[PDB]
Design an enzyme around this catalytic site. Structure first.
Site, PDB file in Angstrom:
ATOM      1  N   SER A 244      30.991   8.680  -5.298  1.00 58.40           N
ATOM      2  CA  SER A 244      31.688   9.939  -5.080  1.00 58.40           C
ATOM      3  C   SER A 244      32.604   9.821  -3.851  1.00 58.40           C
ATOM      4  O   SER A 244      33.659  10.444  -3.835  1.00 58.40           O
ATOM      5  CB  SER A 244      30.709  11.110  -4.938  1.00 58.40           C
ATOM      6  OG  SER A 244      30.153  11.501  -6.186  1.00 58.40           O
ATOM      7  N   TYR A 247      36.399   8.895  -4.196  1.00 60.41           N
ATOM      8  CA  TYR A 247      37.304   9.945  -4.660  1.00 60.41           C
ATOM      9  C   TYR A 247      37.836  10.831  -3.524  1.00 60.41           C
ATOM     10  O   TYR A 247      38.677  11.690  -3.749  1.00 60.41           O
ATOM     11  CB  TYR A 247      36.645  10.796  -5.749  1.00 60.41           C
ATOM     12  CG  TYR A 247      36.447  10.034  -7.040  1.00 60.41           C
ATOM     13  CD1 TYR A 247      37.456   9.959  -8.010  1.00 60.41           C
ATOM     14  CD2 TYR A 247      35.235   9.386  -7.301  1.00 60.41           C
ATOM     15  CE1 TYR A 247      37.274   9.244  -9.196  1.00 60.41           C
ATOM     16  CE2 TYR A 247      35.030   8.677  -8.466  1.00 60.41           C
ATOM     17  CZ  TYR A 247      36.058   8.584  -9.420  1.00 60.41           C
ATOM     18  OH  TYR A 247      35.799   7.877 -10.599  1.00 60.41           O
ATOM     19  N   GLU A 328      26.744   8.629 -13.786  1.00 60.87           N
ATOM     20  CA  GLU A 328      27.836   9.568 -13.714  1.00 60.87           C
ATOM     21  C   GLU A 328      27.320  10.812 -14.469  1.00 60.87           C
ATOM     22  O   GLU A 328      26.504  10.659 -15.396  1.00 60.87           O
ATOM     23  CB  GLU A 328      28.999   8.893 -14.406  1.00 60.87           C
ATOM     24  CG  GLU A 328      30.240   9.688 -14.683  1.00 60.87           C
ATOM     25  CD  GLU A 328      31.489   8.825 -14.756  1.00 60.87           C
ATOM     26  OE1 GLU A 328      32.468   9.308 -15.382  1.00 60.87           O
ATOM     27  OE2 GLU A 328      31.523   7.708 -14.145  1.00 60.87           O
TER      28      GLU A 328
HETATM   29  N1  7U6 Z   1      34.256  13.501  -8.205  1.00 62.23           N
HETATM   30  C1  7U6 Z   1      33.293  12.588  -8.204  1.00 62.23           C
HETATM   31  O1  7U6 Z   1      32.598  12.475  -7.196  1.00 62.23           O
HETATM   32  C2  7U6 Z   1      33.006  11.811  -9.373  1.00 62.23           C
HETATM   33  C3  7U6 Z   1      31.728  11.279  -9.480  1.00 62.23           C
HETATM   34  C4  7U6 Z   1      31.380  10.514 -10.575  1.00 62.23           C
HETATM   35  C5  7U6 Z   1      32.314  10.279 -11.562  1.00 62.23           C
HETATM   36  C6  7U6 Z   1      33.536  10.777 -11.459  1.00 62.23           C
HETATM   37  N2  7U6 Z   1      34.571  10.679 -12.281  1.00 62.23           N
HETATM   38  C7  7U6 Z   1      35.551  11.399 -11.742  1.00 62.23           C
HETATM   39  C8  7U6 Z   1      36.811  11.519 -12.205  1.00 62.23           C
HETATM   40  O2  7U6 Z   1      37.217  10.535 -12.821  1.00 62.23           O
HETATM   41  N3  7U6 Z   1      37.682  12.540 -11.903  1.00 62.23           N
HETATM   42  C9  7U6 Z   1      39.082  12.349 -12.426  1.00 62.23           C
HETATM   43  C10 7U6 Z   1      40.155  13.417 -12.048  1.00 62.23           C
HETATM   44  N4  7U6 Z   1      39.623  14.393 -11.088  1.00 62.23           N
HETATM   45  C11 7U6 Z   1      38.285  14.890 -11.482  1.00 62.23           C
HETATM   46  C12 7U6 Z   1      37.320  13.817 -11.167  1.00 62.23           C
HETATM   47  N5  7U6 Z   1      35.135  11.868 -10.591  1.00 62.23           N
HETATM   48  C13 7U6 Z   1      33.872  11.531 -10.390  1.00 62.23           C
END
Ligand code: 7U6
Length: 351
Positions: A244, A247, A328
């Site tokens: 996480s 991101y 996830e």
């Molecule tokens: N936002 C995260 O912490 C997260 C954790 C686990 C898998 C994820 N997959 C994504 C993801 O691909 N995103 C993509 C575009 N914005 C929303 C989040 N974010 C996460």
């Protein structure tokens, strides 16, 4: 002004999340022309329109030309103006181009929310703008105490769930905040006793956080390409902090970031090993679990306020031909999330 009785860490957070310069910096990271699309001209309906064209580009990619793509690509650039001078911009012709632009649009939606708070409301110099902007969040925010037991548990979650393959950096927890979004607990009452309630991470860049705190975490709108997200349009969480944390999109030019610990009601998980773009779960399932190769040790689970905290060090999960190195977690109804904590973290880049 009367100078604000909020604790220092809380005032710093409010500075961080309402920073107008970080909003603009984010926009120019995405190559948006601020001459043509300045921060104050951003609007939901333009972002929405852009989302639909992106879904058109999705459609043309699903079914295969490079001439019949061009027009769809160009329409996208018509709606969100990018900065390529006298150009020809790069063609949006593959699935990665679709993901990229949908991640960007996500983030503009959130920046628009943040800015409209700054620019809605009243103007009164005798109040501290820190205090004023705090109210705009409709969220109670308290500092959690370094010696408390919840702090110990949290710092251990952070300490034990950092993946070996994300060792380009490590994390110090600077501040820990307990948060209470107005009305969220009411929203969550249906799910407050559901089996398989877990405390999990959600990372985001810091420019999303005013939106996250005022609106909560949200699902991408109907207009958005469902193909843009690996398990479709839900709210994504992880059990490994580093997963996480990535991101946050921190680096050596902005090393501080923000991450969430929400209580997530997973219930009956639909378990998947590969990309699956759905917009509804199968009947009976409440969430998706993307199966990681590695998982926190289920033997080291631990209760914080009657919610499981999966803070054991990573061991093998036993799963064989999975796309995902780490677990996830996705839910497709926003009422299944109750945000509980917010960490401010310092990323040490070893590179
Ligand atoms: N936002 C995260 O912490 C997260 C954790 C686990 C898998 C994820 N997959 C994504 C993801 O691909 N995103 C993509 C575009 N914005 C929303 C989040 N974010 C996460």
């Amino acid at each position: 002004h009367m100078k604000s009785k909020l604790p220092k860490p809380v005032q710093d957070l409010i500075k961080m999340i309402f920073d107008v310069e970080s909003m603009k910096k984010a926009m120019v990271e995405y190559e948006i022309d601020l001459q043509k699309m300045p921060l104050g001209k951003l609007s939901k309906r333009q972002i929405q329109a852009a989302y639909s064209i992106l879904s058109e580009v999705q459609q043309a990619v699903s079914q295969g030309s490079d001439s019949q793509i061009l027009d769809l690509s160009n329409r996208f650039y018509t709606l969100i103006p990018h900065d390529f001078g006298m150009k020809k911009p790069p063609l949006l012709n593959n699935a990665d181009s679709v993901q990229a632009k949908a991640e960007m649009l996500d983030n503009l939606l959130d920046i628009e929310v943040a800015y409209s708070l700054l620019r809605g409301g009243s103007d009164d110099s005798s109040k501290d703008p820190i205090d004023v902007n705090y109210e705009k969040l409709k969220t109670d925010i308290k500092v959690v105490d370094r010696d408390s037991e919840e702090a110990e548990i949290i710092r251990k979650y952070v300490k034990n769930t950092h993946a070996t393959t994300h060792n380009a950096y490590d994390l110090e927890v600077i501040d820990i905040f307990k948060i209470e979004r107005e009305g969220e607990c009411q929203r969550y009452k249906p799910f407050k006793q559901l089996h398989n309630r877990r405390l999990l991470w959600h990372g985001s860049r810091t420019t999303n956080f005013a939106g996250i705190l005022s609106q909560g975490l949200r699902i991408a709108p109907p207009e958005a390409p469902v193909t843009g997200y690996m398990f479709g349009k839900g709210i994504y969480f992880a059990d490994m902090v580093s997963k996480s944390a990535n991101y946050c999109h921190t680096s050596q030019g902005d090393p501080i970031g923000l991450i969430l610990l929400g209580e997530v009601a997973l219930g009956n998980m639909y378990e998947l090993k590969h990309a699956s773009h759905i917009s509804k779960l199968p009947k009976g399932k409440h969430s998706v679990k993307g199966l990681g190769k590695t998982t926190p040790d289920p033997s080291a689970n631990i209760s914080l306020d009657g919610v499981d905290v999966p803070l054991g060090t990573g061991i093998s999960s036993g799963v064989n031909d999975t796309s995902l190195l780490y677990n996830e977690y996705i839910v497709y109804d926003i009422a299944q999330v109750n945000l509980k904590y917010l960490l401010k973290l310092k990323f040490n880049f070893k590179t």
